[PDB]
Write an enzyme that holds these catalytic residues in place. Structure first.
Site, short mmCIF file in Angstrom:
data_model
loop_
_atom_site.label_atom_id
_atom_site.label_comp_id
_atom_site.label_asym_id
_atom_site.label_seq_id
_atom_site.Cartn_x
_atom_site.Cartn_y
_atom_site.Cartn_z
N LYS A 135 -15.41 37.80 -42.56
CA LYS A 135 -15.54 35.96 -41.96
C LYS A 135 -16.47 35.91 -40.67
CE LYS A 135 -10.37 36.73 -41.96
NZ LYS A 135 -10.21 35.27 -42.76
N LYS A 190 -8.76 34.28 -35.81
CA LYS A 190 -8.55 34.15 -37.32
C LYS A 190 -8.91 36.46 -37.21
CE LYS A 190 -12.62 31.53 -39.20
NZ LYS A 190 -11.42 31.64 -40.36
N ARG A 191 -8.45 36.55 -38.10
CA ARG A 191 -8.53 38.27 -37.89
C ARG A 191 -10.05 38.48 -37.80
NH1 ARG A 191 -3.74 41.65 -38.77
NH2 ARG A 191 -5.47 43.38 -39.04
N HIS A 238 -4.73 36.59 -53.23
CA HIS A 238 -5.21 36.07 -52.16
C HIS A 238 -6.63 36.78 -51.93
CE1 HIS A 238 -1.29 34.14 -51.16
NE2 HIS A 238 -0.51 35.27 -51.52
N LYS A 244 -5.55 23.83 -40.25
CA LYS A 244 -5.00 23.45 -38.82
C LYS A 244 -5.77 23.39 -37.96
CE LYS A 244 -2.43 27.86 -39.74
NZ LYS A 244 -2.35 29.65 -39.12
N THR A 282 -6.24 29.25 -44.11
CA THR A 282 -5.39 28.06 -43.74
C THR A 282 -5.86 27.37 -42.13
OG1 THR A 282 -3.78 29.87 -43.29
CG2 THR A 282 -3.68 29.08 -45.48
O1 LIG Z 1 -3.07 40.08 -44.36
C1 LIG Z 1 -3.04 40.38 -45.94
C2 LIG Z 1 -2.69 41.45 -46.35
C3 LIG Z 1 -2.36 42.53 -45.55
C4 LIG Z 1 -2.34 43.37 -45.71
C5 LIG Z 1 -1.40 44.31 -44.95
C6 LIG Z 1 -1.13 45.89 -45.61
C7 LIG Z 1 -1.70 46.20 -47.10
C8 LIG Z 1 -1.34 47.97 -47.78
C9 LIG Z 1 -1.17 47.77 -48.90
C10 LIG Z 1 -0.67 49.59 -49.47
C11 LIG Z 1 -1.00 50.49 -47.21
C12 LIG Z 1 -1.47 49.89 -47.22
C13 LIG Z 1 -1.51 48.02 -46.04
C14 LIG Z 1 -2.13 45.30 -47.61
C15 LIG Z 1 -2.61 44.37 -47.00
N1 LIG Z 1 -3.46 39.16 -46.72
C16 LIG Z 1 -4.16 38.27 -46.19
O2 LIG Z 1 -3.65 37.73 -45.50
N2 LIG Z 1 -5.13 37.07 -47.11
C17 LIG Z 1 -5.32 36.00 -46.76
O3 LIG Z 1 -4.14 34.69 -47.54
C18 LIG Z 1 -4.46 33.38 -47.50
C19 LIG Z 1 -3.48 32.91 -47.91
O4 LIG Z 1 -3.64 32.64 -49.18
C20 LIG Z 1 -5.62 33.00 -47.83
O5 LIG Z 1 -6.18 31.86 -46.92
C21 LIG Z 1 -7.36 34.00 -47.23
O6 LIG Z 1 -8.70 33.59 -47.58
C22 LIG Z 1 -6.44 35.73 -47.87
O7 LIG Z 1 -7.72 36.23 -46.70
C1 LIG Z 2 -3.48 30.33 -39.82
C2 LIG Z 2 -3.59 31.76 -39.66
C3 LIG Z 2 -4.05 32.94 -39.53
C4 LIG Z 2 -5.14 32.62 -40.45
O1 LIG Z 2 -6.10 31.99 -39.92
P1 LIG Z 2 -7.32 32.02 -40.95
O2 LIG Z 2 -8.35 31.24 -40.20
O3 LIG Z 2 -7.56 31.39 -42.44
O4 LIG Z 2 -7.62 33.68 -41.87
C5 LIG Z 2 -3.76 33.88 -39.37
N1 LIG Z 2 -3.76 34.11 -37.76
C6 LIG Z 2 -2.95 33.55 -37.17
C7 LIG Z 2 -1.99 34.16 -36.12
C8 LIG Z 2 -2.45 32.00 -37.68
O5 LIG Z 2 -1.72 31.26 -37.13
#
Ligand SMILES: O=C(CCc1ccc(-c2ccccc2)cc1)NC(=O)N[C@@H]1O[C@H](CO)[C@@H](O)[C@H](O)[C@H]1O
Ligand SMILES: *Cc1c(COP(=O)(O)O)cnc(C)c1O
Ligand SMILES: O=c1[nH]cnc2c1ncn2[C@@H]1O[C@@H](COP(=O)(O)O)[C@@H](O)[C@H]1O
Length: 806
Positions: free
Chosen positions: A544, A538-539, A347, A650, A646
């Site tokens: 971003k 988004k976060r 991801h 939406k 994603t």
């Molecule tokens: O939320 C996350 C990662 C969260 C996360 C949360 C916690 C830890 C973590 C690892 C080790 C120690 C402490 C914490 C790593 C990762 N990633 C994420 O949302 N990636 C998004 O995935 C979507 C679905 O494929 C994509 O559309 C986005 O492009 C991508 O940024």
């Molecule tokens: C879809 C969704 C996201 C992912 O949004 P991106 O713009 O693709 O980062 C994050 N948070 C919430 C609550 C969502 O519904």
């Protein structure tokens, strides 16, 4: 009442009213004289839940009898949001419940607002897992979601004096009517200890035990009577001075206490490692138990394990541990079974996000797994050496073990070695994986690498959140598109239809009025409903580029101040999203947005021509409100940084136009809709690469763009922070000297592109026609399409649209 919400038959309504009253009395132990709206919500939830149970029992019974290949989706996150409306939608109970509650003197929409989000995720990755469960059930796959039941999900965000404050998300305080505790299926998980080598193989001894107790949540498919299971594990201490020993049980139980919110930056925290092993070890025992209930040669024919990122990567050495140490299979046979069972989804390409666990942590916590990882590494590197003789640097680059000050295990390398399929989440991202970060692995095993472009469920993200749009679509093309989103292409026949143009525009206006009302009622802030709703939710991350949006906002303000009596298209700019608690720059960006709002929203010369709103506590339930209301979707990441996105999908489904870079799934969205129907700007990946080669110099842009210079001078001098003039100096410094994401490089093209947006918005008919062209070509972005591709190309199973008996 609208047609897509189903039938309100007299028998059904009567039965729902009766069961509502029964639950209020027997389940809630209340009478109608002292009942609150919360009690009424719970009475409705239990009533709807009752309709799931027969289907749930018979679905699971059906899998036991037919013994299909089972799909196990392992994720540390499931961002589910609310369950009540989704369940009603999928069971065709919405209109019937609406009628039943109305006859009882209650407003169902008011009751729906009471439910807590199940916020067991951070953002995109967590929400993807949730859409995937919905699609797997809808496509009749024997699929199980496995994760952790966090006591506290993603924090509630409060804004105090323009700053993010975090508050614990105590989502279970009032109970969770959807889950069923299964204490009878509790399983042991082992930690620490040491390895003994006997004559009869390795033995992992002197371990500490934590119990994993499962809670099961039903996952209904869309009107097919399939109800699959999401099983989430909760940590419990085993039952074996006195007072302190009882109090110390908390240490074991802390494993499932809280979701890690740091989605930006990997940190080697022991508690997170324990969470990752906990979910893997409990899940794998469940998988094996189910397999043995009708020789491991057949294991990959009966089991698929999908790893959502590297977070459950310990599944690979855990499966090896079980097969070699406990089942006594030879290494080579166990490895063959493991590779054919496991598949890995990546991801992100940002290096700081990759999990690289210190060896010393694994040595102490999971000493047998570390031994297995070393053996995997040695055998893998032997293969690399035979394929690329004498290429010593390749051996260093491909190793699972990273050398340095602290030795680390690269979990992505472990996942590639131990999986038969590795996929990225959008075409451009999957290409970047093959060309850059996993190039060496692609050269060794080209057949492993795949693309599976992300998608979203059209149940939650159209029917549920935008019934008005769903209805006007259904009126023309029928209801079949809800489970076959490609049918939206039929709407291209209506692009010149005056009635449809009017209806699409009317639905958007109504959504905007409803949201404008929500903002006044719940957050005491006034907005103009005739303005362009310009939305970035988004976060908060530097990649971003919420900061680029901020620069445009200030540009518009400065242009208004320069020529106050000139007409400009009125805008409401809304930005929302949570920042990871330890991410200082992201917290500063939130403060900048509110600080801009403070100046802009109170300038009498601006009037209601420009408003800047920070949308507090962005989460799934808020996305369901704001997305249907949006005109313009901001998808403005630096090319090559957003793996897919994603939220982009939406907005497309819900009648917003997109301003975006050629990044992640934006590329495929523009390809589907036509580039003429998308507002594309900025550097492509190739342009970013060229800038990196000669070196990015932000000063050049500052020197050449007078409007950009003015903004930087305003930020530096304290224009947006009169009482603390140097508040934003960290932001200015980063922009000028240390900007990894090249905010200034896309500034000119972005501002020009935004002018073209405003030009189109002045012509409502042409705006709406372009909207229709976007909605009509959004079909590819259904998670049903995504899951069908996983099923056929990775899992080796066939999807089914056929109903189970009711
Ligand atoms: O939320 C996350 C990662 C969260 C996360 C949360 C916690 C830890 C973590 C690892 C080790 C120690 C402490 C914490 C790593 C990762 N990633 C994420 O949302 N990636 C998004 O995935 C979507 C679905 O494929 C994509 O559309 C986005 O492009 C991508 O940024
Ligand atoms: C879809 C969704 C996201 C992912 O949004 P991106 O713009 O693709 O980062 C994050 N948070 C919430 C609550 C969502 O519904
Ligand atoms: O020994 C058995 N006899 C009859 N039915 C069983 C048996 N074991 C499992 N099942 C069925 O399949 C189960 C599904 O749960 P699982 O054990 O988690 O797969 C139960 O809900 C039963 O309906």
């Amino acid at each position: 009442q609208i047609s897509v919400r189903g039938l309100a038959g007299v028998e059904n309504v009567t039965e729902l009213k009766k069961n509502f009253n029964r639950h209020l009395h027997f389940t809630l132990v209340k009478d109608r004289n002292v009942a609150t709206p919360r009690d009424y919500y719970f009475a409705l939830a239990h009533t709807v839940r009752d309709h799931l149970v027969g289907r749930w029992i018979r679905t699971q019974q059906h899998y036991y009898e037919k013994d299909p290949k089972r799909i196990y989706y392992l994720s540390l996150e499931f961002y589910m949001g609310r369950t009540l409306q989704n369940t009603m939608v999928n069971l065709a109970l919405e209109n019937a419940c609406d009628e039943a509650t109305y006859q009882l003197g209650l407003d169902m929409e008011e009751l729906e607002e009471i439910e807590e989000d199940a916020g067991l995720g951070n953002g995109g990755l967590g929400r993807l897992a949730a859409c995937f469960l919905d699609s797997m059930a809808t496509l009749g796959l024997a699929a199980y979601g496995y994760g952790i039941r966090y006591e506290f999900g993603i924090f509630n965000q409060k804004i105090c004096g323009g700053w993010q404050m975090e508050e614990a998300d105590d989502w279970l305080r009032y109970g969770n009517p959807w889950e069923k505790a299964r204490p009878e299926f509790t399983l042991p998980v082992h930690f620490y200890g040491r390895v003994e080598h006997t004559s009869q193989g390795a033995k992992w001894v002197d371990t500490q035990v934590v119990l994993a107790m499962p809670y099961d949540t039903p996952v209904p498919g869309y009107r097919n009577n399939v109800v699959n299971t999401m099983r989430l594990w909760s940590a419990k201490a085993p039952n074996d001075g006195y007072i302190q020993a009882v109090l110390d049980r908390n240490l074991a139980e802390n494993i499932s206490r809280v979701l890690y919110p740091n989605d930006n930056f990997f940190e080697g925290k022991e508690l997170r490692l324990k969470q990752e092993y906990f979910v893997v070890a409990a899940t794998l025992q469940d998988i094996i138990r189910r397999f043995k209930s009708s020789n491991f040669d057949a294991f990959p024919d009966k089991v698929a394990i999908q790893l959502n990122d590297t977070h459950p990567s310990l599944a690979i050495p855990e499966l090896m541990r079980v097969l070699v140490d406990l089942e006594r299979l030879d290494w080579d046979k166990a490895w063959e079974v493991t590779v054919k069972t496991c598949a890995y989804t990546n991801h992100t390409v940002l290096p700081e996000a990759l999990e690289r666990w210190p060896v010393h942590l694994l040595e102490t916590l999971l000493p047998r797994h570390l031994q297995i990882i070393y053996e995997i590494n040695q055998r893998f590197l032997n293969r690399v050496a035979a394929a690329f003789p004498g290429d010593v640097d390749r051996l260093r680059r491909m190793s699972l073990v990273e050398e340095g000050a602290v030795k680390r295990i690269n979990m992505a390398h472990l996942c590639i070695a131990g999986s038969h399929a590795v996929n990225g989440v959008a075409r451009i991202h999957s290409e970047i994986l093959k060309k850059t970060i996993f190039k060496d692995f692609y050269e060794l095993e080209p057949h492993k690498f795949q693309n599976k472009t992300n998608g979203i469920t059209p149940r939650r993200w159209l029917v549920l959140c935008n019934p008005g749009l769903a209805e006007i679509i259904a009126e023309r093309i029928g209801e079949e598109y809800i489970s076959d989103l490609d049918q939206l292409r039929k709407l291209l026949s209506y692009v010149d239809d005056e009635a449809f143009i009017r209806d699409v525009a009317k639905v958007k206006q109504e959504n905007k009025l409803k949201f404008a009302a929500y903002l006044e009622r719940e957050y005491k802030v006034h907005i103009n409903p005739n303005s362009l709703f310009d939305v970035q939710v988004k976060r908060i991350h530097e990649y971003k580029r919420q900061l680029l949006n901020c620069l445009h906002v200030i540009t518009l303000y400065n242009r208004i101040k320069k020529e106050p009596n000139k007409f400009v298209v009125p805008r409401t700019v809304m930005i929302g999203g949570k920042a990871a608690p330890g991410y200082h720059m992201a917290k500063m960006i939130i403060k900048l947005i509110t600080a801009i709002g403070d100046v802009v929203n109170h300038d009498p010369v601006v009037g209601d021509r420009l408003r800047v709103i920070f949308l507090e506590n962005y989460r799934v339930s808020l996305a369901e409100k704001v997305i249907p209301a949006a005109d313009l979707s901001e998808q403005i990441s630096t090319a090559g940084t957003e793996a897919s996105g994603t939220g982009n999908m939406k907005f497309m489904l819900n009648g917003a136009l997109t301003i975006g870079t050629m990044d992640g799934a934006n590329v495929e969205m523009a390809e589907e809709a036509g580039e003429e129907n998308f507002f594309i700007f900025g550097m492509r990946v190739e342009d970013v690469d060229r800038l990196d080669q000669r070196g990015y110099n932000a000063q050049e842009y500052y020197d050449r763009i007078p409007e950009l210079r003015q903004i930087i001078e305003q930020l530096s001098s304290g224009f947006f922070s009169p009482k603390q003039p140097d508040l934003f100096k960290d932001i200015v410094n980063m922009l000028m000297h240390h900007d990894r994401f090249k905010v200034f490089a896309d500034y000119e093209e972005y501002v020009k592109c935004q002018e073209r947006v405003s030009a189109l918005y002045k012509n409502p008919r042409e705006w709406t026609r372009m909207v229709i062209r976007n909605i009509a070509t959004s079909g590819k972005f259904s998670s049903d399409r995504t899951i069908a591709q996983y099923a056929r190309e990775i899992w080796g199973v066939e999807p089914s649209r056929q109903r189970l008996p009711a």
